[PDB]
Amino acid sequence: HSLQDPYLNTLRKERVPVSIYLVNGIKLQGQIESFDQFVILLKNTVSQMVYKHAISTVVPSRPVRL
Amino acid sequence: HSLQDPYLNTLRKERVPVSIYLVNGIKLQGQIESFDQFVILLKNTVSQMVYKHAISTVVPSRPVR
Amino acid sequence: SLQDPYLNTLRKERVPVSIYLVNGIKLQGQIESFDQFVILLKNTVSQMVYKHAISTVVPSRPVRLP
Amino acid sequence: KGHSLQDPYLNTLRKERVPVSIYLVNGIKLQGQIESFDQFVILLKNTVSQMVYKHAISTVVPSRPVRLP
Amino acid sequence: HSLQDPYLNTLRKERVPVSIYLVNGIKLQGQIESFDQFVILLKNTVSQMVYKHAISTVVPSRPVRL
Amino acid sequence: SLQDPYLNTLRKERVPVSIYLVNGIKLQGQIESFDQFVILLKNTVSQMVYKHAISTVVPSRPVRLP
Numbered sequence: 001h002s003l004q005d006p007y008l009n010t011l012r013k014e015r016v017p018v019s020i021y022l023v024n025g026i027k028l029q030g031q032i033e034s035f036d037q038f039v040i041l042l043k044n045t046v047s048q049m050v051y052k053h054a055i056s057t058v059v060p061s062r063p064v065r066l
Numbered sequence: 067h068s069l070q071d072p073y074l075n076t077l078r079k080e081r082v083p084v085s086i087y088l089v090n091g092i093k094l095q096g097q098i099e100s101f102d103q104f105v106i107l108l109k110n111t112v113s114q115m116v117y118k119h120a121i122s123t124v125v126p127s128r129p130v131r
Numbered sequence: 132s133l134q135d136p137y138l139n140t141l142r143k144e145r146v147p148v149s150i151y152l153v154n155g156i157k158l159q160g161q162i163e164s165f166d167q168f169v170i171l172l173k174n175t176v177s178q179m180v181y182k183h184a185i186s187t188v189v190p191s192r193p194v195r196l197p
Numbered sequence: 198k199g200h201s202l203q204d205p206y207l208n209t210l211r212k213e214r215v216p217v218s219i220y221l222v223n224g225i226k227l228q229g230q231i232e233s234f235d236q237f238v239i240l241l242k243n244t245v246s247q248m249v250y251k252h253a254i255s256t257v258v259p260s261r262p263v264r265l266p
Numbered sequence: 267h268s269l270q271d272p273y274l275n276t277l278r279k280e281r282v283p284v285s286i287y288l289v290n291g292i293k294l295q296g297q298i299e300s301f302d303q304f305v306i307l308l309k310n311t312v313s314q315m316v317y318k319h320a321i322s323t324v325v326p327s328r329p330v331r332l
Numbered sequence: 333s334l335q336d337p338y339l340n341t342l343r344k345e346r347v348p349v350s351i352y353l354v355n356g357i358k359l360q361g362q363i364e365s366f367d368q369f370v371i372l373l374k375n376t377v378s379q380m381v382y383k384h385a386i387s388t389v390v391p392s393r394p395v396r397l398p
Contacts, residue, residue, distance in 0.1 A: 003367035007380055022122050023355055023385050024091055036067035046125060049073055054089050054122035056353050056385035063378045088186050090155050099196065102133040112193050115137055120153050120186035135198075152255050154222055166198035171206070176258060179206055184222055184255035221322050223289055235269040245325060248273055253289050253322035288387050290356055299397060302334045312394050315338055320354050320387035 017061040083127040136197035147191040216260035337398035
């Protein structure tokens with residue numbers, strides 16, 4: 001958890017565009033507005049709450065330094 | 067946790083129409099009637115119980131908070 | 132808990148229900164009993180369904196809500 | 198109601214050696230009889246004796262009606 | 267793990283070749299090198315790490331006794 | 333556990349790997365870091381992978397097992 005939090009928090013603070021792929025193959029895009037232990041609030045063309053358990057990978061639009 | 071609860075509770079109180087997408091791709095629509103640690107009660111024709119573990123995303127029909 | 136009182140109402144009232152699995156399959160019958168991890172579904176034949184494999188429980192008619 | 202239902206149910210199928218079908222979340226249908234089980238897996242006997250993870254199981258359907266204790 | 271540990275440990279010790287079916291339908295084959303609470307190390311050309319949560323069934327190539 | 337030392341070796345030794353997701357997709361790269369729930373993979377694209385979405389981790393060459 002010592003890696004996930006800083007990573008998501010940095011993406012959030014720096015408003016880094018991200019692509020979030022779900023386990024079912026669907027791709028969501030936007031910026032991370034906030035998150036907690038179980039969900040990620042993604043804002044963009046469509047604001048939405050995403051459950052982490054349904055996420056396979058988070059691919060930042062550019063590398064992030066922690 | 068700190069975000070999911072306030073978020074769901076807001077959608078509930080404001081009776082905001084939502085779209086709930088399941089991990090299998092199916093889309094449910096209705097209003098959040100109530101929820102607990104493991105389920106969400108989605109109201110429509112009849113209120114159905116959705117297990118959170120089966121949910122991918124919750125998309126509000128309008129801006130909240 | 133909201134799940135327990137809800138399932139108990141469906142059980143007590145013997146309400147016909149549809150149980151959708153996470154893989155899209157639809158089961159029909161009535162809730163005979165349940166515990167923390169499974170539900171006993173009675174229909175043409177009885178069967179034990181793991182809750183981790185359930186997506187939604189849809190009653191055939193409105194029922195008292197917890 | 199932790200395992201108040203699951204344990205007595207699986208144990209009945211086990212002791213009575215009831216033929217059963219176990220459907221997995223991916224759609225596969227396994228057949229045989231429950232040899233034993235613990236909190237996470239089920240040992241299913243058929244052509245061979247295999248270990249099934251409960252997390253991959255959707256439903257357990259007895260070949261015939263069963264009476265719980 | 268009253269059954270899981272003894273079972274996997276026997277397969278490991280007897281070096282019994284096994285078929286591991288994943289929840290996505292892919293079939294892996296090899297010998298169990300080791301395992302812990304979350305993963306199993308499956309040896310073949312190279313030893314790959316398999317997450318238990320992705321496993322549906324473990325099928326021994328030949329009968330084993332517990 | 334086995335997972336940690338195993339992943340740490342692949343990391344410390346910059347071993348190229350293939351991570352197969354529970355949905356079949358194959359990711360390739362080198363493990364940059366990881367914690368209890370995610371693995372940061374890097375190669376052509378950098379990305380955070382949730383362990384719950386991973387089925388197997390396959391090294392490009394044999395490595396010292398834990």
